[PDB]
């Protein structure tokens, strides 16, 4: 048996815009759409993923970076597949004026770094800016802050989760799984950062 606390709630799924960008111009200039989109101050839900397989030691390289940037868009882009590293999003990421929001997204910043020598700036640890607005003190995870403040839970496909990212091209399933990650991020830290 089990308490009403511990019951399996529905599935967080992202319904809007997922665009999907593989080519390292495209992705600079859809960068700068993202910048014309937003203004100082403004916050986007962050997240990345990287294939399964370790690479001397360490985890695998960055194959995928995800950009929610409102309710209804969200970007999703393939660096795995890009010649270089896209000039735009780097600007983009070492921005002081558009902050970016996750669990976990300290560590986020180390790997980055050392798979691309960006220096990620400006983010915010949800687990903070909860602690802070909802006046407590837990440990949160992306998950428990989604079943908290919005009622569901995050897609679970372990399978899907621990895919190989850095494969061209994404599925349906992952482009959709990346694209919510990055969602969930942009919701918690707009419905957090209302209260007061």
């Not at 190989?164 to 599925?171: V, Y």
């Given at each position: 048996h089990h308490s009403v606390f511990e019951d399996d709630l529905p599935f967080l799924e992202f319904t809007g815009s997922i665009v999907y960008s593989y080519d390292a111009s495209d992705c600079s200039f859809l960068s700068e759409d993202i910048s014309m989109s937003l203004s100082d101050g403004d916050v986007v839900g962050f997240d990345m993923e990287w294939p399964p397989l370790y690479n001397r030691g360490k985890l695998g390289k960055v194959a995928l970076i995800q950009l929610c940037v409102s309710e209804s868009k969200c970007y999703l882009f393939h660096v795995s597949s890009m010649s270089v590293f896209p000039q735009g999003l780097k600007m983009l990421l070492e921005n002081k004026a558009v902050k970016k929001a996750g669990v976990g997204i300290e560590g986020d910043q180390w790997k980055l770094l050392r798979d691309f020598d960006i220096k990620l700036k400006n983010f915010v640890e949800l687990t903070d800016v909860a602690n802070k607005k909802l006046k407590c003190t837990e440990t949160w995870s992306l998950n428990s802050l989604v079943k908290h403040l919005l009622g569901k839970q995050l897609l679970k496909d372990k399978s899907i989760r621990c895919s190989?990212?850095?494969?061209?091209?994404?599925?349906e399933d992952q482009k959709l799984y990346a694209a919510t990650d990055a969602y969930a991020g942009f919701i918690i830290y707009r419905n957090l950062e209302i209260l007061d």
């Open positions: 190989n990212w850095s494969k061209f091209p994404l599925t």
